[PDB]
């Protein structure tokens, strides 16, 4: 599979051909069938004029399936080969030594549109929150840090994709098969994908700090504002480092295949996945508790005229993006046993919703937020008086 390994085998096949460049069949007559080869495979001599054949190479991958088939050539004392045009193309039976996925490109386009949309709105949303001094509070500080984690996730995604294209696509454009084998080993490439793991983990945990704060607001015995903020910032930005760095250590030491991109060992993939699932789990419990509190307040909310249903539906939809509960659906269950069409379904909903999660969060907590709208109306009226 690995291009690297195939090229490695090709290079040692030239060493094999150099071994056969010393061990030589006797040259034949004036003009032996024998000619020459470039890389290809090693050449035989043989009496000029026989059904001479060479076994199939064992290194070619599409020939690991079939190495029984060989090359069916023919010749005489011409000195050359069966050539439609001399020294241009031979008649070799290469058909026995040789034998898509458009969903991935479809998925790529979908998420990268949402991430671009989310990034554009988040920087606008972040500026609005920081710009107005009135909206400076602990709650908005958690919102600002949540926006940064979303922004970091979006930027890291773009870079990881550029890297992946730099790995093979644009490398093939240069028509060089030596420097890319080295980008594949540059420690610079490893840090690119290591950053993506941290940015993704930070985004999930800053969603866990968004719901753990909200829960502590609804539970009394509140502590010092200063102290809690420092702990929340430490949890949002430091706890992900507690399992992202060990994952990189295991990769560098026992995997280090290609830029830490392939999860060959599923056990090492759990190092990051399990803390992510723990964060998603706790957030789901907070999501249930908050909704239970909301329905309890609406049930005694004076009117409580069945509009319970509408308002409860209008309160559940605005709380899903702020806590990332859409992950719950196909997460705990469908892991990496999810194969077949279930894979595509689980990937499509996760990639699309998460990419557009930043846009929804920015809209729901910066633009339709009454506090901001009344702040904008005030500011515009303040300038209107001049």
């Amino acid at each position: 599979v690995s291009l690297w390994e195939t090229v490695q085998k090709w290079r040692e096949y030239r060493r094999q051909c150099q071994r056969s460049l010393t061990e030589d069949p006797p040259p034949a007559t004036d003009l032996f069938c024998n000619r020459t080869f470039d890389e290809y495979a090693c050449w035989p001599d043989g009496e000029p004029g026989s059904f001479v054949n060479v076994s199939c190479p064992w290194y070619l991958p599409w020939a690991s399936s079939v190495p029984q088939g060989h090359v069916y050539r023919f010749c005489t004392a011409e000195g050359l080969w069966l050539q439609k045009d001399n020294s241009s193309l031979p008649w070799r039976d290469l058909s026995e030594c040789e034998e898509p996925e458009e969903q991935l490109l479809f998925l790529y386009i979908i998420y990268t549109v949402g991430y671009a949309l989310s990034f554009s709105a988040l920087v606008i949303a972040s500026a609005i929150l920081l710009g107005f001094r009135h909206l400076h509070c602990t709650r908005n500080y958690i919102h600002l840090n949540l926006f940064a984690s979303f922004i970091l996730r979006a930027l890291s995604v773009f870079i990881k994709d550029a890297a992946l294209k730099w790995m093979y696509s644009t490398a093939a454009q240069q028509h060089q098969w030596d420097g890319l084998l080295s980008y594949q080993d540059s420690l610079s490439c490893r840090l690119v994908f290591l950053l993506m793991q941290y940015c993704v983990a930070a985004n999930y945990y800053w969603l866990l700090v968004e719901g753990v704060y909200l829960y502590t607001l609804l539970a009394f015995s509140v502590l010092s504002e200063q102290w809690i903020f420092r702990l929340y910032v430490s949890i949002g930005w430091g706890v992900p480092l507690l399992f992202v760095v060990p994952w990189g250590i295991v990769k560098y030491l026992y995997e280090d295949e290609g830029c830490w991109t392939r999860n060959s060992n599923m056990n090492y993939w759990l190092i990051i996945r399990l803390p992510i699932l723990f964060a998603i789990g706790v957030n789901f419990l907070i999501f249930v508790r908050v909704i239970c509190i909301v329905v309890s307040k609406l049930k005694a909310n004076l009117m409580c005229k069945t509009d319970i249903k509408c308002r409860l539906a209008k309160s559940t939809l605005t709380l899903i993006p702020l806590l990332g509960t859409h992950e719950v659906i196909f997460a705990f269950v469908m892991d990496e046993h999810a194969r077949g069409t279930l894979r595509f379904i689980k990937l499509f909903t996760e990639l699309s919703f998460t990419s557009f999660q930043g846009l929804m969060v920015a809209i729901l907590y910066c633009f339709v937020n009454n506090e901001v709208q009344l702040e904008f109306r005030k500011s515009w009226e303040r300038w209107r008086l001049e």
Binding site: S2, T6, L164, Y168, W177, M196, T261, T354
Partner: peptide, 29 residues
């Protein structure tokens, strides 16, 4: 997470596809 799974799936494909293209460019051509 989903982002890691998609990148791993994408890398498995792009790599293999490029290896096939490599053989073509080199051995066959």
């Amino acid at each position: 997470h989903s982002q890691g799974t998609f990148t791993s799936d994408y890398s498995k494909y792009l790599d293999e596809q490029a290896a096939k293209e490599f053989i073509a460019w080199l051995m066959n051509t």
